[PDB]
Each structure stands twice: as C-alpha cells, then as structure tokens.
Amino acid sequence: MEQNSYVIIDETGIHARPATMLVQTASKFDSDIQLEYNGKKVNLKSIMGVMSLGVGKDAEITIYADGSDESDAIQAISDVLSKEGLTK
Numbered sequence: 001m002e003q004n005s006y007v008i009i010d011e012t013g014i015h016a017r018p019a020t021m022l023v024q025t026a027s028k029f030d031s032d033i034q035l036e037y038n039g040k041k042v043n044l045k046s047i048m049g050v051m052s053l054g055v056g057k058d059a060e061i062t063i064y065a066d067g068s069d070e071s072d073a074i075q076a077i078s079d080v081l082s083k084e085g086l087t088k
Contacts, residue, residue: 001066003036004074007059010086014055018084019047022063025076031067033077044077055086 008014014022026033026044035044035053037060042049044063055061065073081087 001064002070002074003034003062003064004078005036005060005062006078006081006087008055008057008061008086009088010084011057012086013057013059014050014053014061014086016047016051018080018086019050019053019055021080021084022077023047023050025080026063026065026073029067029069029073029076031065031070031073033067033070033073034064036062036064061087 033044035042035050037053063077
C-alpha cells in the first residue's frame with residue numbers, strides 16, 4: 001500500500017467540491033485509496049468523511065492507496081489536490 005501526505009493551504013479546507021474530485025479520481029481508478037488527517041484516516045471514496053475530516057488550512061492530510069493503480073491513484077490525488085490549490 002502506497003500513501004501520500006500533504007498540507008492544506010486552502011482556507012476553505014478540503015470541502016465537498018474538491019473532496020469530490022479527490023474521492024472521485026481516487027476510486028475512479030480502482031486501487032483502495034484512503035484519506036488520512038493527523039492520524040485520522042478515512043475512506044477516500046466518501047465525502048461525508050473527507051468533509052467531516054475538518055481538512056482545515058495549515059493542516060496536514062494524507063491519502064493511502066492499495067491496489068494496482070495505488071501509485072497512479074496517488075499521482076492523481078496530489079494532482080487533484082494541487083489542481084484545486086488546497087495544498088502547496
């Protein structure tokens with residue numbers, strides 16, 4: 001299983017807007033990607049979780065992936081994350 005950590009830079013804190021794309025692009029692949037935040041792991045396939053993940057700004061989040069696209073899913077995430085600008 002391959003994961004990926006990041007830092008929130010969006011004062012909006014990963015919301016349903018992005019959480020959607022991330023979650024989407026996450027499962028959209030196949031691998032079993034999971035969201036994490038300050039030891040708070042969840043399902044990167046559900047918003048209710050990514051949303052209730054209080055992905056506040058200045059907060060460091062993470063995402064896991066265990067499949068055949070895991071790495072590919074991780075590459076998509078960071079992309080979606082940076083794509084929106086919730087991180088870096």
